[PDB]
Protein: 5'-3' RNA helicase-like protein
Organism: Thermochaetoides thermophila DSM 1495
Amino acid sequence: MENNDLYQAAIGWYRAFEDCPPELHLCCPKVDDDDYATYDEPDVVDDSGVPVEEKKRRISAYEERFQNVYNLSILLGLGKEVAGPWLDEWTRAVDSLLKKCDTCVRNWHRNRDPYLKALHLSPEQVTYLQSKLDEFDRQRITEGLQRAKAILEQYGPMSTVKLVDHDMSAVLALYEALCSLPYLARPEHQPLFDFVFENTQRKKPLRMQGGIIPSMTLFLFDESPVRRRFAETAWENRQPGSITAQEWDWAISGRLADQIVSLSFNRLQTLPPGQKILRFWSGFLFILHALSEKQIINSLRAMEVSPSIYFLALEHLGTNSDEALAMVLRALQELMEKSSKAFWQALEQVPPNQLVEEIFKSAAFRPLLNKSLRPELLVTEGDSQVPALAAWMRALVRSLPSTSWSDLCETSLRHLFETFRSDQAVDQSGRATCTLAGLVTLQQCLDGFLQQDSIDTGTGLIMVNQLLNRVVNYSEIIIRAASLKPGDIYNVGISKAAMAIIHSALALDAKATEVEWAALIAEKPVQDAVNRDSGALWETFLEMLWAGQLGHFELAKAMLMATLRLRSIEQFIPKRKEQLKRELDKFNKRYQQQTTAIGKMLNRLTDFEPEVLDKLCSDPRGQTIHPIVSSLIHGEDAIREAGFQLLKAITSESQPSDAVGRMLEVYFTPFLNAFSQAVDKLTATKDANSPWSHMIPILKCSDFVLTGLCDPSSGQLRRKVLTTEEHAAVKRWWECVWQAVDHSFRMMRIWHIKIDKKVMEDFCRDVMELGNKLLAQDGVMASSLAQESGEDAISKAMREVLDPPRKCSYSLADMLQLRDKYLVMGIIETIKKLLSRLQENEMNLPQRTRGHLDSMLKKTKQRDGRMDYLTKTNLTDVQRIELLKALGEDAVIEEQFMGTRLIPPMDVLHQAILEWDIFHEGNDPPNGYRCGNVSDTYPDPYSYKQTFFPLLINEAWRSFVTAKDETTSKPFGIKVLSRMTVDKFMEVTAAVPAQISKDRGLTEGDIVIISKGEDPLNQPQELHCLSRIWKTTYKKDTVEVVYRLNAKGNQILPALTPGSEFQVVKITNMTTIEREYAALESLQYYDLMDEILKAQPSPMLTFGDEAIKAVMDNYQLNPGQARAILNAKENDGFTLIQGPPGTGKTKTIVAMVGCLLTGVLKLLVCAPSNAAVDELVLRLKAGVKTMNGTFHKIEVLRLGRSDVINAAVKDVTLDELVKARMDAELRDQLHKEAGEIKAKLAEIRPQLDAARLSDDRASAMKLQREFDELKRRQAHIGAKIDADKASGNTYARETEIKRRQIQQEILDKAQVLCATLSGSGHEMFKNLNVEFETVIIDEAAQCVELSALIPLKYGCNKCILVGDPKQLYGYDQSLFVRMQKNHPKDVHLLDMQYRMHPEISRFPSKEFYEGLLQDGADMARLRLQPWHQSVLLGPYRFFDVKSLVNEEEVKVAMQLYMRFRSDYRDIDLTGKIGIITPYKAQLQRLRQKFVERYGESITEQIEFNTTDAFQGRECEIIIFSCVRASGFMTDIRRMNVGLTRARSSLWILGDSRALVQGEFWAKLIEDAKQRDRYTNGNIMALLS
C-alpha cells in the first residue's frame, strides 16, 4: 500500500526527524553549528572529546541517521500530494539542512546513485523518481543561483571570506553545483552556471574541502582554463591511495569508464583525435599520481571496462600525435613502474616482443627526436636530460622477467640497432637519440644480468656474445660513441654509457668464467648453450682499449677491476693417462686464451706513457693496485712476466727489488694491504692442488717484499716510520708471510713423495733462508716494530709475530725428520736460532710444539729399547745435545748423553764491552774488581763464574784500556745511514769505496772510533765513541758495510745522521778477544775441575830412569831433560817443565814430539806466537822420525797465519789447499740477447708510433700483433735475465756447501795440527768433527791464563806444557804459576842442564837461577867451535861500562863494532849480533848510528832487535847493552830474561851508581873485582 504503508513509514521518518533532536546536525556528525571536530577520525579520539569508542559512536550515529535517510529517500520523494503536509515539511527541512552541510549534500548525492542501484523500481518508475528528485534539486539550485547573482550584481564583487558573509547559502549552492552532475548535464543551465563560475572562479582556484568532482577535470580537457587550474589544484593535493574505493566508484571508476568509452577504439572504429588522446592521457597521469599499487591491482586492474586501461592503452597506442605520443610513452612508463605485475599480466595476451614492435612503429618517431633534442622536450632523467625513449627502455627492462629480457633485447636491437634505428631516415640528433636509447637499454640489461648469483650455462653468454658481435660491427657505432669526440652538440654522454657497457661486459665474462670453473671443479651439471670467445671478446674491447685513446684512464681502470675477478681462477691440471672431457678441454683452452688476452691487456696498460701510467697509478679506489699485485703474484708464467714488466714500468726501476722498494716508499699502506689480500686469496688454493711449483713465485715475491720493507739500508720499514694503519698492515703482512711459510712446509710435509730432489732443495732452502732472515732481520724488524717500550710490550709484539710461527713450529719440527745433510744443518740452525730466541722471548712454545719436540728430539726408550729421539733424527750427538739444550734441561742432557761445549750467547760479553768505556778514567772500576788466589783451582766450576767473572770484567777493562792508547792509524770519514735502536745498539751502513775499505781495513768484529770532531786524539770535548762492525757485504760495486754500533745513549744519538756523515776511524780488532771471552765464559764445563776449578793443579809422579839414556840415544834427549819429564811424560793432566831457554827448549820440544810419537805412533800443538808456531812446524813436520826409522809422520796442518809467515809452510795452510781444490773443481749471451731485444723493441717503438696513426684495420691489427709479440718476448727475456741475476744466491750456496764439504773431507785426512788460541777462535771448528786427547802447549809463560783454557776445548786428557818460572796487577800471571808456587813438590824443575859455558852460565845460574840451573858440560870442549876455539875472541867476554844517548855508550857500541870489524876482521852478524836494549828510542838511535857511522850497508850487517821480541831467535855474538830500569819485572826480571835470552858475550853497558837500582849489576861488578866477570873503564883507548 503505497499511500498507507508509505504514510506509516513517513510517520516513522517524521518521528526520526522532528521527535529526534534537530538542534544537532541531522545529516552530519556535527554536534552543533560550531562543531568542527575531526569527524574523519572515528577510529581515533575525536577532538570533540569522543574517544575511539565515542568517536565510533558519533560515526555510527551519523551512519544510522544516514540509513534512516536512506530508507527515507522514499519519504523525501514521496511528494506532498500523497502525504499531505508531511512531505512539504520534509522538503522544507531538506532545503534548510541538506543545503547547510556540504559533506552531507555530497554524501546524499553519492548515495542517491547507490540508492538507485538499491532502488527496486521499474525503469519508468526509477526515471520518474530520479526526475522528481532532480526537479526539486534544480529548483533549489536555480533559486540559490538567482540569489547569488542578485547579491553579486548589487553588492558588487566580494572575496571568498566576504562572499561567505554575503551568502554562505550561495556558497553552499555553488558547492552543490560543483557536484550537480544533472544540472551540469542540463544544457539550459549551462549559461547561468558558466556566468556564476566566471564571476566566482576567476578570482582564485577554489581550495574546497571534502572530495573532488570531475567537472573541472573535464573543463581541463575543455576550453575552460580557470576550472582547469581549479581541477589541477584540487587533484595535486592527494597522496598514493588517498581516495577511498567508495569515492573511486562514486566519481573515479565510472567517469574513467565514461572517458574510455568516449575514446573507445572499438566504438570509434577509427583513429582518435590527437588533442583528445593527449588530454585523456594527461588526466590519467594526473589522477594516477595519487594512486596505490593495491588500488592498481585490486581496483585499476579490476576496473573491467572495454577495454581495460592496459588493453585500452594497447589499443590506443595508435594515438598518432607527436606530443600525445610522448605523453603516452611517459604514461606507459609510469604505469609499468607502478606495478610490473600489472603491466606484464594485464597485457599477458600481448607478447613483449609484439608490444615492442607496436611501440617502435610510431609515425611521429622520426620528428620527435628534433623536439626531444630541445631542452623543453629533453626528458629529465637523473641529473641529466636524455630522450624519453631511454626512460621507456629502462622501465621495460626493469619490469621484464629475466628470462623474458633476452628475446626482447634482440627485438630492442631491431628497435635500436637492427631494423628501426638502423634505418637511414634518422637525423643527426635523431640518430644520436636512437643510439643513446639503444645503449641505455643494453646497459640496463647488462646491469640486471650482473646482479645474478648462480645459473647453468644458459643463453646469457649468448646475449653477451650477440652484444659483442653487434658492437664489433658497431665498433664504429658503439666503440666510437665510446671514441666519440666529446663536446659535440649531438653528443648525449653516450661515451660514458659505452665505456660502462664495455666494463660490464668484461665483468660478466669474468663472472661466467668463474661460474664455469667452479662447476667444473665441483663436477656439477652445466648446459651447452653457447661458447664465449673471451679472447676475441676482449680483442673487440682491446681495439678501443688501445694505447693513446682519449679517456683511456677509465677504460683501463675498468679493465683492471674486471680482470681482478679471475684472481682465484686456477687452471685444472689434467689427470695422468687421462684425456680431459670436451667441457674440461674447452675450459682449459678458454682459460689459456683469457690469460693470454689479460696479459696482452696488461702489457698495453704498461705501454701507456710514463706520465699517463703515473697518473693512473694514483687511483683513489686502489683496486687497480690490487689487480697489479695480483698480476705480480699471478701463477701463470706469462702473466708473471707481464706483471713484473708492468710493475717495473710503473715504479720506474731496473730490477724487481728496486721497484718493490720504490713502491714501499711510495704507497706502503695500500700496497701492503693489497699484497696481504692477494696472499690470503692465493694461499686459499685447495691443499690437493695448492701451489706446489707455483708457491716458488709466491716465495720469491715474499722474499722481495721482505728485502724491500725490512732491508738494512734501503728498508722502508727501517728507513721510514710506521703509522697505525701502516702498523696494522705490517702486522698483517708478517702474519700472512708466516702463515704462507707454514702452509708451504705443511704442503711439503705431504708432498715429500712429490718433491723432486732439486726442487725440494730449492723450496726447502728458500723457506730456510726466509726463516734465517726472519729470525735475524725480522728480529731486527721486530725491534723496529715493537708494540711499546719494555720487555713485556716488545716481547708481546714478538710473540704476536711468533704466534703464526708458534703454530708453524709443529711443521718446523716435522721438517727435522728430513734427511738432506744441508737441509739437516739448515733445519738445526733455524731450530736453534729461532726456537731458542722464542724461549728467550719468555713465550712458551705451543703444547703441540712441545709435544712434537719431545716425540722427535727428546731421549725416550723406543720399543726395541733405543733411548733416542722418539722420532728418528740423524742429527749428530752435538746437534742432538744442542736440540736438548733448546729445552734447557741439563739434567735431561746428562741422563740422556752424559749418563747422569758450544758458543754461548756473546751478547753478555758484547754488552759488557760496549758499556764499559775504555776511554773512561777509572784505575779501579766502579765494581771495585781485584785479583786474588786461585788455589790452582777455584773451589767450584761455578766458582769460576762467581769470582773470576769479576776478574774477567777487570781483565776486559784492562785490555780495553791497553788497546785504547795504541791507535797508530789514519783517521777516516764515513757517511752514516740511519739510527734505529735495537737492544741498546744500532746499525751504521755505508757503501764505502773499495779504496776506503782497503785503507781503513774494515771487517766484521772490529771496533772503530766513530767520531764527528776533527782531531779527538787530543780533543776530549769532541764527539767520539766506539762501534762494532757487524757485516760487510757489497751493495752493487762499493762495499756496503753495516756495523753493529753501540747505541748506549751518548751525545751522538741526537746527531742521528741520515746522510750527514761523520769521521769514523778503526781502533782495534776484538775477534781474538771475543774468542777469549767466549772460552772463559764457556769452559765452566771442562774436565779440568780437579785441575782448574776444584782445589789444586795436576798431580806429579816419579818413576825409574832406565830409559833416559835410551831416549837420549833414540831422539837426542838427556836424563836431565828426562828427569823433569819423568814427572810429566808418563803422568796425565796439565804438566809443565821449567828450565832456561838455553837448555835446548826448542830441541827438547822436538824431542818431546818424537817421544809423544814413540808413545802414540789429533795432536794439537798450541803456541802463543805465530813465528814460534812456524819454527815448531819446521822442527816437527820437516824432521819426522817415528819409532820405525823412516820419515813416518802424522798429517801435519798449520792452522796458523801464513800471510805473516815464510812460504815454506804455506803448502800446509789448508786454506790454499781448499782454494786449489775448489778451483780444480771449478749470462754474457743472455745479456747480449737482452740488449738486442731491447734495441729491436726500441726500433719497433718508432714503427709503433708510425703505425699508431695509420688507422688502417689490417695495418692496425698487424702492428698491434707485432707490438704484443715484442712485449711478450721482452717480458720473457727480462724474466730470464732477472732469474740469471737471482741464480747468484743459488750458486753461492752450492759453492759454500761444496767448500764446507771439501774442508771437512780434508780435515778427515789430518792427523796432527799446530795453531794458536785464536786459531780455534774460528767458528768453523764448531761445524768440524775432530778427536783430541793429547795437547802440547808451547811457552806457557807467554800467554794469558784465560786463553790457556781454550786449547782444552777439544776434550783432551793428556797435556804437556813448556813454561819456565824464570824469563818472566798480576791479572794474567800464569796457570803454571799456580802449579809451581802452590805445589812446588808437584812440579819437576830440572837442576842439571847443558849447552852453556860454565863461566858464562855461572852468572845466570847464581844471580838469576838461584844456582839450581847447573851449567853446561865442557862448552870449552863440547862447544870447542871458534866460540871456544878463538881465545882472544872469547865466547864469553866480560866487559862493563862505567844515559842511552850518551856518546860514551852509543860510541862504545860503535867502537865494539869497529873492533869486531877492525881488531877482529871477519865476523858476520847476520842475525848474530845480540844488540838488545830496553828502550825503543835507543833501538832506533842504534839503527841510525849503524846506518850513519858504520854505513847504511852495515844496517843489515848487525841485527838490531829488542830483547823481548828475540825469543826463539838465536844470535852468536850477543853484545847486549841494557838501557835502564823500567821495576824489578821489566828491570830485574827482564834482567833474568836477558841472562837467559842473551847467551855468549857479557859486554855489558851501564854504571854501578846508575844501575844501583839493580843489585845484580853490583854483584856483577863485585865478581869482576873477584873472577873477572866484567871490566870497566874507557875501552876507546883499548880499541886504539
Remarks:
- The first helix runs from residue 2 to 19.
